[PDB]
Amino acid sequence: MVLSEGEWQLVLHVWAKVEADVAGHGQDILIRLFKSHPETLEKFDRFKHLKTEAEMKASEDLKKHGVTVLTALGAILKKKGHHEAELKPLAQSHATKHKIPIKYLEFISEAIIHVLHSRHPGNFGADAQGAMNKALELFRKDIAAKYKELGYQG
Numbered sequence: 814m815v816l817s818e819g820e821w822q823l824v825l826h827v828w829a830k831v832e833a834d835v836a837g838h839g840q841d842i843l844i845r846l847f848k849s850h851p852e853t854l855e856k857f858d859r860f861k862h863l864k865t866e867a868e869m870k871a872s873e874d875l876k877k878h879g880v881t882v883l884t885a886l887g888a889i890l891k892k893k894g895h896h897e898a899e900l901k902p903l904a905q906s907h908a909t910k911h912k913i914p915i916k917y918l919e920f921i922s923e924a925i926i927h928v929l930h931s932r933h934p935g936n937f938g939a940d941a942q943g944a945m946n947k948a949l950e951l952f953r954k955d956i957a958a959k960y961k962e963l964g965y966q967g
C-alpha cells in the first residue's frame with residue numbers, strides 16, 4: 814500500500830515524459846482503453862458514437878478530454894499519496910454522475926501502463942512499472958473507499 818519515496822520518484826520520472834505531450838498520451842490511453850474494453854466507451858455519452866480508432870484520433874473533444882483526465886491524475890500522483898482533496902470531487906462525479914465501477918478503473922490503469930510501457934522503455938522498465946502499478950493501486954484503493962462512503966458499490 815504506502816509507496817516509498819524511491820517508488821514515487823520512479824512514478825514522477827515517467828510522468829515527466831508524459832508531460833512533454835499530455836494530449837498525445839491521453840489519445841493513446843483512451844484509445845487503448847476503448848479498443849481493449851469496448852464496454853467502457855458506453856459510459857461516455859459524448860463519445861460513444863465513435864466507431865473506429867481513426868474517428869477517435871480525429872476527435873478534438875476526445876483529445877481535450879484526455880488532457881483533462883491525465884492532468885487530474887498527474888496532480889494526484891504529484892501528491893505522493895496525500896491526495897484526499899483531489900479525490901473528493903473525482904470520486905463523487907465518477908460514483909454518482911458517471912457510475913464508473915472499480916473494474917473500469919482497473920481497465921484504464923491497464924491502458925496507462927500499456928501506453929507508458931510502449932512509449933517509455935527508457936523510464937518504464939520493470940521496477941518503474943511496479944512503482945506505477947503500486948501508485949495506481951493506491952489510487953483505486955482510496956477511490957474504492959470514497960465510493961463506499963458515497964453509497965456506490967463500484
Ligand code: HEM
Binds near residue numbers: 856857882883918
Ligand atoms: C485514472 C482514472 C480517471 C481519472 C483521473 C478521470 C478523470 C476525469 C476527469 C477529471 C473528468 C472531468 C471532471 C469530472 O466529471 O470528474 C472526467 C469525466 C468523465 N470520466 Fe473520468 N477519470 C478516470 C477514469 C474514468 C473511467 C475508467 C471512465 C469510464 C470507463 C470515466 C468516465 C468519465 C466520464 C463518462 C466523464 C464525463 C466525460 C464528458 O465530459 O463527456 N472516467 N474523468
Ligand SMILES: O=N[O-]
Binds near residue numbers: 817818819820
Ligand atoms: O526505497 N525504494 O523503494
Ligand SMILES: O=N[O-]
Binds near residue numbers: 884
Ligand atoms: O485540461 N486541462 O487540465
Ligand SMILES: O=N[O-]
Binds near residue numbers: 843
Ligand atoms: O476518461 N476518464 O474520464
Ligand SMILES: O=N[O-]
Binds near residue numbers: 895900901
Ligand atoms: O486519500 N483518500 O481519499
Ligand SMILES: O=N[O-]
Binds near residue numbers: 906
Ligand atoms: O459531482 N460531479 O458530477
Ligand SMILES: O=N[O-]
Binds near residue numbers: 846849923925
Ligand atoms: O490496455 N491494456 O493492456
Ligand SMILES: O=N[O-]
Binds near residue numbers: 937938939940
Ligand atoms: O525491466 N527490466 O528491469
